[PDB]
Design an enzyme around this catalytic site. Structure first.
Site, mmCIF file in Angstrom:
data_model
loop_
_atom_site.group_PDB
_atom_site.id
_atom_site.type_symbol
_atom_site.label_atom_id
_atom_site.label_comp_id
_atom_site.label_asym_id
_atom_site.label_seq_id
_atom_site.Cartn_x
_atom_site.Cartn_y
_atom_site.Cartn_z
ATOM 1 N N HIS A 172 0.860 -1.143 0.000
ATOM 2 C CA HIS A 172 0.000 0.000 0.000
ATOM 3 C C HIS A 172 0.906 1.205 0.000
ATOM 4 O O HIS A 172 0.689 2.132 -0.768
ATOM 5 C CB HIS A 172 -0.944 -0.048 1.203
ATOM 6 C CG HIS A 172 -0.481 0.686 2.425
ATOM 7 N ND1 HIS A 172 -0.236 0.057 3.618
ATOM 8 C CD2 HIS A 172 -0.305 2.023 2.650
ATOM 9 C CE1 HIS A 172 0.079 0.959 4.542
ATOM 10 N NE2 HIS A 172 0.051 2.162 3.979
ATOM 11 N N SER A 232 3.104 2.803 8.797
ATOM 12 C CA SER A 232 3.123 1.642 7.905
ATOM 13 C C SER A 232 4.520 1.263 7.402
ATOM 14 O O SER A 232 5.493 2.027 7.529
ATOM 15 C CB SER A 232 2.243 1.894 6.656
ATOM 16 O OG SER A 232 0.952 2.414 6.951
ATOM 17 N N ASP A 275 -1.283 -6.624 1.568
ATOM 18 C CA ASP A 275 -0.697 -5.281 1.519
ATOM 19 C C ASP A 275 0.710 -5.419 1.999
ATOM 20 O O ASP A 275 0.985 -5.364 3.197
ATOM 21 C CB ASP A 275 -1.450 -4.312 2.451
ATOM 22 C CG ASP A 275 -0.693 -2.992 2.677
ATOM 23 O OD1 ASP A 275 -0.139 -2.450 1.701
ATOM 24 O OD2 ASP A 275 -0.664 -2.490 3.822
HETATM 25 C C1 LIG Z 1 0.415 3.420 4.681
HETATM 26 C C2 LIG Z 1 0.351 3.502 6.269
HETATM 27 O O1 LIG Z 1 0.946 4.521 6.581
HETATM 28 C C3 LIG Z 1 -1.089 3.515 6.758
HETATM 29 C C4 LIG Z 1 -1.097 3.297 8.250
HETATM 30 C C5 LIG Z 1 -2.180 4.069 9.026
HETATM 31 C C6 LIG Z 1 -2.743 3.232 10.188
HETATM 32 N N1 LIG Z 1 -3.188 4.012 11.351
HETATM 33 C C7 LIG Z 1 -3.569 3.455 12.498
HETATM 34 N N2 LIG Z 1 -3.935 4.208 13.515
HETATM 35 N N3 LIG Z 1 -3.572 2.138 12.634
HETATM 36 N N4 LIG Z 1 -1.896 2.478 6.089
HETATM 37 C C8 LIG Z 1 -3.154 2.715 5.724
HETATM 38 O O2 LIG Z 1 -3.701 3.802 5.899
HETATM 39 C C9 LIG Z 1 -3.896 1.578 5.057
HETATM 40 C C10 LIG Z 1 -3.509 1.408 3.601
HETATM 41 C C11 LIG Z 1 -4.425 2.361 2.911
HETATM 42 C C12 LIG Z 1 -5.743 2.051 3.588
HETATM 43 N N5 LIG Z 1 -5.327 1.867 4.988
HETATM 44 C C13 LIG Z 1 -5.988 2.095 6.142
HETATM 45 O O3 LIG Z 1 -5.433 2.057 7.232
HETATM 46 C C14 LIG Z 1 -7.472 2.406 6.089
HETATM 47 N N6 LIG Z 1 -7.772 3.246 7.281
HETATM 48 C C15 LIG Z 1 -8.278 1.120 6.146
HETATM 49 C C16 LIG Z 1 -8.097 0.229 4.953
HETATM 50 C C17 LIG Z 1 -8.580 0.607 3.691
HETATM 51 C C18 LIG Z 1 -8.407 -0.222 2.591
HETATM 52 C C19 LIG Z 1 -7.737 -1.414 2.722
HETATM 53 C C20 LIG Z 1 -7.251 -1.795 3.955
HETATM 54 C C21 LIG Z 1 -7.418 -0.981 5.061
#
Ligand SMILES: *C[C@@](*)(O)[C@H](CCCNC(N)=[NH2+])NC(=O)[C@@H]1CCCN1C(=O)[C@H](N)Cc1ccccc1
Ligand SMILES: *C[C@@](*)(O)[C@H](CCCNC(N)=[NH2+])NC(=O)[C@@H]1CCCN1C(=O)[C@H](N)Cc1ccccc1
Lengths: 258, 40, 52, 32, 48, 44, 52, 48, 258, 32
Positions: free
Chosen positions: A43, A205, A99
């Site tokens: 991702h 992430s 991911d």
């Molecule tokens: C790419 C990273 O920085 C980020 C982490 C943020 C997580 N925050 C907390 N408090 N846990 N990853 C993401 O944002 C991921 C990938 C893009 C979508 N995603 C999400 O966290 C969404 N909020 C939920 C989600 C959407 C689509 C597919 C999977 C998860």
């Protein structure tokens, strides 16, 4: 990394840092596991939803950092890359299923006191140390709250931040989300009835859900901060990729290039 | 002015902004060392 | 495109602010030059020959 | 190369723990 | 005139030695460093 | 490049040596005109 | 006085616009550095003595 | 950020070879030159 | 210069161009009479009314320019200066009596094709050539119009401009002038009934009121465009210092530090 | 220095006048 503590020095010699060349953006933490290979959130590389299709010649990684900002002369190493190696079975459409993504280096990196790759999961160790309630450590310079809306205190960190949080049984992770649950996916946090809030957040992430092996005190990142429905909400848990299971692909890729 | 000449077509040769900084980077730091060390 | 804006090629920003932008060494340049000479020289002498 | 991985030069290879290396262990079923 | 620190990309570890600082700038640092080193010298000599 | 008898300053402490953009500028403009000269002419 | 701005010393704009600002030479700078080194180390070692 | 081609004086001829070009800039001027030459070279290689 | 002409190359190989380091601006014109000395309007350097106390470190001269702007690659010589000498008796207060200033070169200048100074008037040629109606040329990239008021068309030249005009008898000068005339000062223009406009103008000071010696066909500047009520007006004529009469001081200055 | 001054190498030194080098002469009471 919410509710944490300005991490120590060397704790993570694998803590890679993905940076956006132009402009200068700290996009994601990465996973160092070799002088020419690194694990990272798929991702983190391309999220069409958020319109994202970053390539080798677009992003770079700063190895072994402590400060998100200030350079780290002599010590800090940032090498270019070779070719990114994402997982074809990477489906963001529905739920970031798988991911995660592996990557090569234009030129290796000299593991020093500050530089070292984490150990890759073994079948035993694998299922072995992955039990509910199990506390684990992970890290990523990632933010810490819900930035784009009403929020005081502070924005991003200065020095890498640490998180030591327990594992959570699938059903809990399942009922706490509106997103398809996986056998590779897995959250983990700190129930509404224990005390220590905190959890990963925006951008943390690509980091490593580390875990030190008892049998030999060897360290193991056994997860990849995939996502999280917000940032540390009681009853809500961050989810992380599943190396070991996913582990297969990865090597097959390494087995052909590196 | 020329004295370090090493290819008349290109005339005299100098160091590099790079070679300099590092010399400072080395220079400066060791300095402070003794300093802060004495400051105590 | 009526006046003239100078060219600023091959450079990058240094990890440390205090250094920031870093440009082609003289060497980089120099060599960069002659890498275009030879091809040119030909392209040029390759005229006359067809011209006479 | 592995078989040398997961070893912090300023820890596991020079013997020592992080401010809280107990937690993981102490999180295994119950404290140490 | 023109501004926003142009349109340049970051520097790679390789870049070092094949792309160096701005003469002008270096000096400035070169100068700055010394001064602090002197006033601070003045400081020691004088406070003692 | 150099060693000593070529220059009067040289200092290894500052690493390897290279030209000066001044030096280059001069090589450009010069070099450059020579080109056109031939160009210009041939053009006719 | 609370953040930090970079210092860009010894610069002059060249009579030719396209060439614009001119920065010191490697030599030019290298030279200055050692200019400070001699007096520098002197006063440095000048300390210690009195310190011991 | 900051702008107005800062705050520098005009260089005196004495300056040259004590105050030289800004690397990046150079290359661009070189690249500029050569190209015209090329196209113009092809422009002639082609007319025939 | 007003009502002039795009002068040709080389006629002015002594035509210096005084400039300001910061901001780079052309302030006046100067006069080349030696590889180390240049003559010019003292007011151009110091004028408290318009607050002006410039110094060498502040300005330099652009020798042998044609275009008042674009550089003149491999040709135009620019040299910093050394010691600025101005005649103490120079009175700006009342009317610029003895308005003339000289300078020495921080480093000499080589006279070539475009580089070369004007000869210095002798007693003979002196009053000898100075006479009503006798025309004289001068030179300066100065103005050409009444600067701050109703004025369009063309304002600043692109290349040194041509100007030749007759020497006028004192009376005319004195009557038209509302300023204390001097034997050192002196006008020159085209009376209302002859038909040829043109005159020295804003900034054209420090220039050379050139005049060729019939004797040995050499050239002699005899007056420094000091001033003038407005630029090119019926009844008004620019005034120019009287070299020889004040030539004495001149030697005095060079003789000492030359 | 002088003794070589007042002469244009692009006119004087190489024999020739300027677009209107005559006018001054021509202003000496009357023409040449
Ligand atoms: C790419 C990273 O920085 C980020 C982490 C943020 C997580 N925050 C907390 N408090 N846990 N990853 C993401 O944002 C991921 C990938 C893009 C979508 N995603 C999400 O966290 C969404 N909020 C939920 C989600 C959407 C689509 C597919 C999977 C998860
Ligand atoms: C400094 C010169 O560049 C500038 C040129 C224009 C003057 N005359 C003609 N005909 N263009 N000279 C001046 O501006 C002079 C010196 C500064 C004041 N000055 C004037 O011409 C005033 N406008 C009038 C005057 C009053 C008292 C003393 C001298 C001049």
């Amino acid at each position: 990394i919410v509710e944490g503590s300005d991490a120590e020095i060397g704790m993570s010699p694998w803590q890679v840092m993905l940076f956006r060349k132009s402009p200068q953006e700290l996009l994601c933490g990465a996973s160092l596991i070799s002088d020419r290979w690194v694990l990272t959130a798929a991702h983190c590389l391309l999220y069409p939803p958020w319109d994202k299709n970053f390539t080798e010649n677009d992003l770079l990684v700063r190895i072994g950092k402590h400060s998100r900002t200030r350079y780290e002369r002599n010590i800090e190493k940032i090498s270019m890359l070779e070719k990114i190696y994402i997982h074809p079975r990477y489906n963001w459409r529905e739920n970031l299923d798988r991911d995660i993504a592996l990557m090569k280096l234009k030129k290796p990196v000299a593991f020093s006191d500050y530089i070292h790759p984490v150990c890759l999961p073994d079948r035993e160790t694998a299922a072995s140390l992955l039990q509910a309630g199990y506390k684990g450590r992970v890290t990523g310079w990632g933010n810490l709250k819900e930035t784009w809306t009403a929020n005081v205190g502070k924005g991003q960190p200065s020095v890498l931040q640490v998180v030591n949080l327990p594992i959570v049984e699938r059903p809990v992770c399942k009922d706490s989300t509106r997103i398809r649950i996986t056998d590779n996916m897995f959250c983990a946090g700190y129930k509404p009835d224990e005390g220590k809030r905190g959890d990963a957040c925006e951008g943390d992430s690509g980091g490593p859900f580390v875990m030190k092996s008892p049998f030999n005190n060897r360290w193991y990142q056994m997860g990849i901060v995939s996502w999280g429905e917000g940032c540390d909400r009681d009853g809500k848990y961050g989810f992380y990729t599943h190396v070991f299971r996913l582990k297969k692909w990865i090597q097959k890729v390494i087995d052909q290039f590196g | 002015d020329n004295c370090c000449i090493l290819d008349e077509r290109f005339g005299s040769y100098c160091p590099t902004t790079c070679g300099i900084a590092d010399f400072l980077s080395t220079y400066q730091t060791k300095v402070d060392k003794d300093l802060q060390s004495l400051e105590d | 495109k009526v006046e003239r804006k100078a060219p600023d090629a091959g450079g990058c920003l240094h990890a440390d602010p205090d250094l920031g932008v870093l440009c082609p060494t003289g060497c980089q340049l120099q060599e960069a030059l002659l890498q275009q000479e030879r091809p040119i020289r030909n392209s040029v002498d390759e005229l006359n020959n067809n011209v006479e | 190369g592995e078989a040398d991985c997961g070893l912090r030069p300023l820890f596991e290879k020079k013997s020592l723990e992080d401010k809280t290396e107990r937690e993981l262990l102490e999180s295994y079923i119950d404290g140490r | 005139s023109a501004c926003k620190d142009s349109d340049w990309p970051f520097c790679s570890d390789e870049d070092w030695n094949y792309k160096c600082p701005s003469g002008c700038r270096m000096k400035g640092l070169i100068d700055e460093v010394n001064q602090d080193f002197t006033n601070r010298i003045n400081k020691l000599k004088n406070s003692l």
